[PDB]
Write a protein that binds this ligand. Structure first.
Ligand SMILES: C[C@H](CCC(=O)O)[C@H]1CC[C@H]2[C@@H]3CC[C@@H]4C[C@H](O)CC[C@]4(C)[C@H]3C[C@H](O)[C@]12C
Ligand SMILES: C[C@H](CCC(=O)O)[C@H]1CC[C@H]2[C@@H]3CC[C@@H]4C[C@H](O)CC[C@]4(C)[C@H]3C[C@H](O)[C@]12C
Ligand SMILES: C[C@H](CCC(=O)O)[C@H]1CC[C@H]2[C@@H]3CC[C@@H]4C[C@H](O)CC[C@]4(C)[C@H]3C[C@H](O)[C@]12C
Ligand SMILES: C[C@H](CCC(=O)O)[C@H]1CC[C@H]2[C@@H]3CC[C@@H]4C[C@H](O)CC[C@]4(C)[C@H]3C[C@H](O)[C@]12C
Lengths: 328, 328, 328, 328
């Protein structure tokens, strides 16, 4: 997975992600109105939304759980795989705000209006490995949270504590921990976006054979660390050189570079890991944009067109049918 | 630029390219019917089409010139940048079939029905640096040619001779020469598509932190050599592991990985080099599919819907307006 | 700098380092006998040796300070540059065992007989930035400690605490922190020491063009992170495949691979960073072996030949005069 | 193997090589005086030396054959492995100067005084796969030739022709062909010897964590292509920044960086490929310097101390016994 936050030329804030998995999670785009009571049937735990929510998720055992989404106030959150270095408590910890893994994303979006509000609430928080149903293990996760102020944070629970990092990179991938990736960026201080046309090697003249010689050394594989480096620098380059050109499609161009392609990222179970979908939320406007591996046309769902004072969950069908514009 | 040939699950043959440039060439999708006489006004040279042609190009000084295209017989050709190691003759060479640089692509498509036919015609061919108009230098180019048999060739004129390579890789980028890239592939024999989950480093257990550990070492920059390596192995992996899944969208997924992103590939003139468009021709069906940097929705133009016995050139407008599916 | 611990075919334990600096520190090989009182004239602080010590260092303002060394009991310690992430206290911390930066190495060797003894003593230790003389800033350092049991530890003081890591890698370089490097090793689980002779790329046969195709992707620069990776895997490979062949010269072969070469590692002050010397201590035998950038012949100083019950510091001259064996 | 030519601060010319093999070839340092008739017993072919010769080789079936050496006139030649792209004729070609593979090095040194003389003689030359004895296949080889003018050439016979390249890089390794490696250098125009201390990544400050950030992207494995890149740039950096410091030991520092280490370069036959020896010839002085994997002390054999008008081949024993300077 790759998370990305990007400000447009008009001052709007985009936040979204690549979803990198080898399976379907029966996903749909889920809208939840204000004052809606979500009840988990297995453990009787309840959540009533303060703010309306829109995002990608699934309804499991009659309970909504999210992969990424936003609320009506322009707060966004995405859950990304975090298989190594993660540690959840087995049960509730006395004196803490205990949040089940499956419910963390919804807990953020339903309750808070800003990154600053979330940061305060997380000071005494603990993420607990309570199954959504039966005894099913929760997915190993860490979260990126971003809002209309342009501020982003990263939430990672380890065996030590619940870490909340300020994210000045604007990106997130997977393991290792966020501080590891930030330190890893320092190894690439020698990268250059500007073409290096020549090098005088003593008696031999060296000439650039094509565009892009400044970035030689950039890692090209699909590991979380390599993807983190690529997205961090691609984002930086666009902001530095083309701030006044940043719009919706640019978000997708950045994430396309770190997208997994069928056949080349094979799991030990011999399945192809794919970028199943790419989502981009315009936080101010409350519009959820996305495309899929099967259908690259961007689809838009505007939460503000729905009744925020409604009484039911509304779902929209995940679009995996290629949409072609037939010109003639 | 990156050229790609790919066979689908149904046995159809896709051929196309990323167009990587920092400028617009006033491009449109151009259809030329059978028996159409193309006259160059500056040098009075003429070409009358035997076969109908469809592809991306421009009409310069009243004369059509192509970036990539196909004919009605399922022969495809793409012209890609070749700034180093290229050498054209200044004038016609006696006893040779002399083809002006700007006219090579059209010469291939208008006259021949197969790769085998082209190969025979190229034995005594020479590419000459005749300006399309005025004294304007021709773009430095090499060509990939592919047909419905699945065979591909690469055409490169150097100071030595006009080279015609059998292309068993299914890909092409830019400089250096094709044989250089083929030899460069040998450096990556150690790549693996299958996950490497662990490594026992004596007393230290090493564990994969995410998917993709087998491809560590793959180059991630945007130079022609690095892009060649990436597209070659991404293509190979898909054919090996997912032959029965290959369809139209897979072509775009492969090329997306080597697409240039605004801001990060800066020329010495301080302009952003971009993948302006991505084309994919279904050679059997005569359908030209493409999307653009601005609009990622795939557009389709079917040459077989047009009158192949028509009397005029027909053009279709280059689509750079983002097409979004508004769901609600 | 690069630290290395290696067990020989006979069961002896070698420990030593590359010294990577752009300057001379007026170094000599220093022997200190038992019961010798070292007095710092500037701050009146005193240290009386329990065990005899031998290693590379300098006598500054009449006080001995070490770069690397061992004691008579087979305990070894090396101080390596640690410019980022280091944090010393400005003054003594109440209730802690406060050790000045310049004196840490000698404090370890003079007082303790084993890694286990040191580990216990470090639990309540604190490293303080007390100048050796005047107001001169101490070098930013972290330490590797190793003994005749084959156990190694890494000592790093950060803004959080004094960290003592178990070192199961057998190596150390410079910044970032030790846990960062250990996690970085996981990115290279795909490395192979065994030749990969071929790769079938569909219709194209790829053949290894020379030996070493399994390690493609290994970083080749001279940064601390890249050097850590190289030494870790070179060491692992030798132990796995040639345990029964490991002797003195093998230690030097490993470190030669990460040695800096004049001209190519230039500081911002435009000086060449060099591997000034390479030391290798046979811990059981008490022999300090070393060579230098100028003279590659290995020199040996045996501490057990000296009087351990002596009354004076004894120094031996740093050998930087090339020693050639003239055969004819 | 890695060949290197380097000019010293005093204007002397050093030429030599790493010998990278997994076996012993019963090597000794061989001196052949002037006017000495070498007779091959198996094929009755004869060679009488014009100039006296000194270098590493072996006496096989009573016939001397060389790995690397020089003559009394300051001409040097080294034979390096060339397993791919090599092509020898099966028999003598009519009208050509036919030279058996095993005899090429000696043919160069025994007959010619300069690179220019050799270049002229090679115009009509052909290298033939005649066995030294029995039906034993000759080693696949290419050659580097260098003299006291500082000029170097590379000799490679392919299926096309006998190629003689001007070598302006000052280095050679193994396969692919020399022109391939020269073109490969162009991919690294973005390398920098000078430290890059920082990078402003928008809201995140990136800081160099150690020396060497300018060379990130340099390949670190032991393949011929990677070694070629490393030696080319290490040599260039030393000449650019430290021309007035270049002496004998610097030659060894450069080659040490590309030396193979026991255990990590394993052949398909499960043997460790090693840098068995490193030779450095001072061409003006006629001194052959070398060390070995087992003994790193440099040994010197001066051909000018021998009788150049002698009547016998003289050999000196290959030194593989570690020479240590015991100080106390
Ligand atoms: C799809 C996202 C994000 C995962 C990722 O980005 O790696 C994850 C986050 C939480 C995940 C759910 C947690 C509870 C369940 C765990 C089961 O073992 C699989 C189904 C469920 C219902 C999961 C489905 C899906 O796998 C979710 C919604
Ligand atoms: C766009 C393709 C492919 C270029 C590439 O892939 O790099 C190229 C191939 C031939 C090119 C034309 C050749 C003749 C002209 C040369 C002028 O200096 C620029 C305009 C023209 C009319 C060119 C426009 C455009 O640049 C074309 C059509
Ligand atoms: C040489 C080693 C190791 C340094 C390294 O490996 O980077 C270091 C460790 C402690 C260092 C000494 C600390 C105190 C002094 C600090 C001064 O600013 C330079 C001279 C002194 C006397 C230093 C000399 C030298 O620089 C030493 C002995
Ligand atoms: C050692 C050098 C250089 C090889 C290299 O650098 O790879 C080579 C060059 C020519 C080689 C000789 C050629 C003829 C023989 C071929 C046999 O199959 C092995 C023994 C002999 C006598 C070889 C021994 C040795 O292998 C030599 C002397």
């Amino acid at each position: 997975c790759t998370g990305l936050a990007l400000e447009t030329k008009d001052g709007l804030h985009l936040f979204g992600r690549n979803m990198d998995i080898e399976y379907s999670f029966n996903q749909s785009i889920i809208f939840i109105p204000r004052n809606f009571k979500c009840v988990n049937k297995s453990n009787k735990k309840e959540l009533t939304t303060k703010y309306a929510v829109l995002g990608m998720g699934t309804i499991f055992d009659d309970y909504p759980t999210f992969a990424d989404g936003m609320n009506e106030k322009g707060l966004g959150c995405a859950g990304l795989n975090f298989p190594v270095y993660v540690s959840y408590s087995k049960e509730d910890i006395e004196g803490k705000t205990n949040i089940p893994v499956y419910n963390f994303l919804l807990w953020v979006l339903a309750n808070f209006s800003s990154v600053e509000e979330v940061k305060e609430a997380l000071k005494n928080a603990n993420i607990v490995d309570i199954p959504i149903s039966e005894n099913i293990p929760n997915t190993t996760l860490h979260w990126m949270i971003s809002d209309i102020t342009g501020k982003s944070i990263v939430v990672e629970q380890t065996k030590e504590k619940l870490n909340v990092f300020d994210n000045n990179i604007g990106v997130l991938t997977n393991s290792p921990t966020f501080d590891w990736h930030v330190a890893n960026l320092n190894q690439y201080v020698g990268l250059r976006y500007n073409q290096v046309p020549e090098f005088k090697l003593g008696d031999q003249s060296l000439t650039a054979l094509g565009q892009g010689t400044g970035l030689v050394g950039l890692p090209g594989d699909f590991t979380p660390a390599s993807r983190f480096i690529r997205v961090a620098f691609l984002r930086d380059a666009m902001i530095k050189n083309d701030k006044d050109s940043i719009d919706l499609i640019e978000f997708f161009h950045i994430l396309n570079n770190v997208a997994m392609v069928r056949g080349s990222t094979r799991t030990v179970e011999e399945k192809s890991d794919l970028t199943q979908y790419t989502s981009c939320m315009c936080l101010e406007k409350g519009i959820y944009y996305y495309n899929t591996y099967e259908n690259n046309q961007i689809n838009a769902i505007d939460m503000n067109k729905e009744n925020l004072d409604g009484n039911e969950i509304k779902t929209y069908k995940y679009n995996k049918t290629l949409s072609i514009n037939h010109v003639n």
